[PDB]
Write a protein that binds this DNA or RNA. Sequence first.
DNA 1: GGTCACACT
DNA 2: TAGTGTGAC
Length: 424
Amino acid sequence: ATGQDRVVALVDMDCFFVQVEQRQNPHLRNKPCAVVQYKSWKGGGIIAVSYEARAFGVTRSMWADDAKKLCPDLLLAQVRESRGKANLTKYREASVEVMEIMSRFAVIERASIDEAYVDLTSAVQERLQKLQGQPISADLLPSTYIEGLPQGEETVQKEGMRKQGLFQWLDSLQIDNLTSPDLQLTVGAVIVEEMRAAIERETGFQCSAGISHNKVLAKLACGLNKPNRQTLVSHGSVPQLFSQMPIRKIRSLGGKLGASVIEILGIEYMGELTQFTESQLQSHFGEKNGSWLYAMCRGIEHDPVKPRQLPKTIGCSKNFPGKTALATREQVQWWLLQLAQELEERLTKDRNDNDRVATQLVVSIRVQGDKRLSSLRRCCALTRYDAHKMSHDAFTVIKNCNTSTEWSPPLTMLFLCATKFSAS
DNA sequence: GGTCACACT
DNA sequence: TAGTGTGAC
Ligand SMILES: Nc1ccn([C@H]2C[C@H](O)[C@@H](COP(=O)(O)NP(=O)(O)OP(=O)(O)O)O2)c(=O)n1
Ligand SMILES: [Mg+2]
Ligand SMILES: [Mg+2]
């Protein structure tokens, strides 16, 4: 196939944590902004950045003190601290607002706290049926961009260029054909406009979206015209788009695999992948990766949009870097208890909200000087939503790790995760 | 820094 | 694992 079977959208909130704080605090609005956690060290780590702030070069993971140097006026919203650790409840709850709205339109997959994939194939056919032999107006796509267009003097302005590109696309469109993938993408884009308007109107949160035939392309497209804009990436636009597209850009090619792909094949762009036979790619990167790469560089992916509105696992973690590493048994127990308590609060709310219970508890830790995020992973049955029992059980699981009332080596990280959810 | 999902074997 | 490592937000 040409992988034009489905219409898929990825909707991603623009600087989400910042928006949540901005909505709550009007003074932050339309200003260089960032969300930080753990203010005491280096002003705290920046985890979210407003677009005004990004203009000053402020970036995520940048110490607030350093960010201040770039942007003296930068406004900061602090992640809530509960029980001595960052609490992300406000953002999770804000995420639910967005997810619930999106769920109304189509079957959604929660890719992250601030984004979800949508399969609009069914919705599109019905809408196509609803409007018959009906030409699609540009007004229905006020925030839509057509990648690769315009092509072949208002062009000086970005909005003018967007209008020209959109017009070229629409004039080209043949609406008398229901089957056409481009038409389907276009109608899908119309719905996404409606979906995004509903999100903004109902939550006050602005978002961006990518409309394409698969998840990878939808995701890539979404990023192209952020913020507060949606981009339609057609099948035909892929060759030109991928021709200069760094391999790392494609989802899942951001890490080692992307590097090896680049390193082994001596190429920099997605498009260059077309040269190679499927076997060739399979030989270097194996059976699953090779097939995925071969199809993907051709704008073809089959990964389905999973029907998962609600997350699979609920986890609590904290880090005790460097000196702060826990070197006493009582210390480990107290922190396990703090994690367990928050987990219990989240688990209990989850059970009431989602009608399910977690049957398995996962405990993960890191010892100092270990190069691995997890020094050890251990699991024990989770039979009660009791923080004291859970923390007590977790200690039992990891206690042996200690080497000779004091803990050695000191623990750099503690992780608690509830998993294996069951209906209740 | 804190949470995720998932492909391994 | 069951338990580890990858890639993501
Ligand atoms: N390393 C990261 C990346 C994201 N996040 C959190 C904070 C973000 O606001 C939120 C959403 O991630 P994101 O979509 O990658 N970025 P954000 O929404 O902030 O800005 P956009 O670029 O998407 O407009 O998750 C995080 O906590 N740690
Ligand atoms: Mg976002
Ligand atoms: Mg995101």
